[PDB]
Design an enzyme around this catalytic site. Structure first.
Site, PDB file in Angstrom:
ATOM      1  N   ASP A 244      91.335 -39.126  77.293  1.00 15.59           N
ATOM      2  CA  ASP A 244      92.496 -38.313  77.703  1.00 15.59           C
ATOM      3  C   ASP A 244      93.707 -39.234  77.755  1.00 15.59           C
ATOM      4  O   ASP A 244      93.918 -39.932  78.766  1.00 15.59           O
ATOM      5  CB  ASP A 244      92.233 -37.626  79.041  1.00 15.59           C
TER       6      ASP A 244
ATOM      7  N   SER B 289     110.063 -36.477  68.781  1.00 13.42           N
ATOM      8  CA  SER B 289     109.959 -36.020  67.396  1.00 13.42           C
ATOM      9  C   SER B 289     111.345 -35.706  66.850  1.00 13.42           C
ATOM     10  O   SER B 289     112.200 -35.287  67.629  1.00 13.42           O
ATOM     11  CB  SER B 289     109.058 -34.763  67.370  1.00 13.42           C
TER      12      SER B 289
HETATM   13  C1  R9Y Z   1      88.667 -27.930  82.556  1.00 12.78           C
HETATM   14  N1  R9Y Z   1      88.779 -28.721  81.327  1.00 12.78           N
HETATM   15  C2  R9Y Z   1      87.535 -28.929  80.618  1.00 12.78           C
HETATM   16  C3  R9Y Z   1      87.819 -29.334  79.196  1.00 12.78           C
HETATM   17  C4  R9Y Z   1      88.457 -30.732  79.259  1.00 12.78           C
HETATM   18  C5  R9Y Z   1      89.566 -30.787  80.280  1.00 12.78           C
HETATM   19  C6  R9Y Z   1      90.538 -31.786  80.217  1.00 12.78           C
HETATM   20  C7  R9Y Z   1      91.647 -31.780  81.047  1.00 12.78           C
HETATM   21  C8  R9Y Z   1      92.690 -32.865  80.966  1.00 12.78           C
HETATM   22  N2  R9Y Z   1      93.920 -32.403  80.244  1.00 12.78           N
HETATM   23  C9  R9Y Z   1      91.763 -30.746  81.967  1.00 12.78           C
HETATM   24  C10 R9Y Z   1      90.796 -29.760  82.066  1.00 12.78           C
HETATM   25  C11 R9Y Z   1      89.701 -29.770  81.230  1.00 12.78           C
END
Ligand code: R9Y
Ligand code: NA
Length: 330
Positions: free
Chosen positions: A35, A199
């Site tokens: 991430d 961008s």
């Molecule tokens: C709830 N969900 C599962 C899929 C992966 C993921 C990643 C983030 C970070 N942006 C936030 C929620 C989430």
């Protein structure tokens, strides 16, 4: 040193990508969501509320001979979608694709939101934004990349996400076989702790390129491309029957449509997102209304170049003293 790991879509829509990560001694392999929009490495664990675990692999620090409790340290994160997790902290050995960090903060979840419990394929997140966003209190912790940086051949990692296919995360080197043409580098602001860049504009399908500055973040942890409402309206105006639905929560389009491409500028270079990349399929099983992969950022407060955009490019996250982003076609 270098590392190289394969990243795999969790489902048929590329909703997220998981990468295997070795934690502890002997190794416990967990599949984490890398991430670039957050800075916590957190995992489902033996401490996670039992009712909040549904099929995830858990980290068990008591089974690791190298795990140490980071005494007094806690963490709690809230993501832009409303998801959350929190817990306590261990230090342990963490390896990605053969690259090893000793004394990495591994944030053990005591609590996760239902949105995480429901994703049985995601065992946690490995944050790759700047360490200034790390949520550990009272002593903020470093990312895996920040801990590895000094040992790497070059202070970089690269994201090469696949469309409906595996891709690669590399640490410490730039695979010159993985892209076409040249890499165009662009400035980064670290003021908000993100890989924030500007961008130089966009085009819709075969249309003329519109020169316009669009500030946003390069975020591998976000599925879709979130852009200003003017840009998003211009895109969906080229799709017969597309509309913004408040009931569904964004732009939808007829599943019978052929979507146009979307081009974004990186300096004088151009990255083309094929139309197929923008199709996120039926809104509900069997529906003939499909969810779009380009959405408005108006309700977010930031533009987000998430996976829909990043998977169209080979992306360099350059963590030199002055960080920069690089984009290449592939
Ligand atoms: C709830 N969900 C599962 C899929 C992966 C993921 C990643 C983030 C970070 N942006 C936030 C929620 C989430
Ligand atoms: Na959705």
């Amino acid at each position: 040193s270098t590392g190289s790991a394969t990243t795999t879509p969790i489902d048929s829509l590329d909703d997220a990508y998981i990468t295997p990560v070795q934690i502890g001694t002997p190794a416990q392999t967990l599949n984490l969501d890398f991430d670039t929009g957050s800075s916590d490495l957190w995992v489902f664990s033996s401490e996670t509320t039992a009712s909040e675990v549904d099929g995830q692999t858990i980290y068990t620090p008591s089974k690791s001979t190298t795990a140490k409790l980071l005494s007094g340290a806690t963490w709690s994160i809230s993501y832009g979608d409303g998801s959350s997790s929190s817990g306590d902290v261990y230090t342990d050995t963490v390896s990605v694709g053969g690259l090893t960090v000793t004394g990495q903060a591994v944030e053990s979840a005591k609590k996760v939101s239902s949105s995480f419990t429901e994703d049985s394929t995601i065992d946690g997140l490995l944050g790759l934004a700047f360490s200034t966003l790390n949520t550990v209190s009272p002593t903020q912790q470093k990312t895996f990349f920040d801990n590895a940086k000094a040992s790497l051949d070059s202070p970089v990692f690269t994201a090469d996400l696949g469309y409906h296919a595996p891709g690669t995360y590399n640490f410490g080197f730039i695979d010159t076989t993985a892209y076409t043409g040249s890499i165009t580098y662009t400035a980064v602001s670290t003021k908000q702790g993100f890989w924030e860049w500007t961008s130089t504009g966009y085009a819709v399908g075969s249309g003329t390129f519109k020169s316009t500055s669009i500030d946003g973040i390069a975020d591998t942890g976000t599925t879709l491309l979130y852009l200003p409402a003017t840009v998003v309206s211009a895109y969906w105006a080229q799709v017969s029957g597309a509309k913004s639905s408040s009931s569904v929560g964004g732009y939808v389009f007829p599943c019978s449509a052929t979507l146009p491409s979307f081009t974004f500028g990186v300096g004088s270079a151009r990255i083309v997102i094929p139309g197929d990349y923008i199709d996120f399929g039926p809104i509900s099983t069997g529906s003939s209304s499909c969810f779009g992969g380009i959405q408005s950022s108006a309700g977010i407060g930031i533009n987000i170049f998430g996976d829909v955009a990043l998977k169209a490019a080979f992306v360099v996250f350059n963590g030199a003293t002055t960080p920069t982003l690089g984009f290449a076609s592939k």
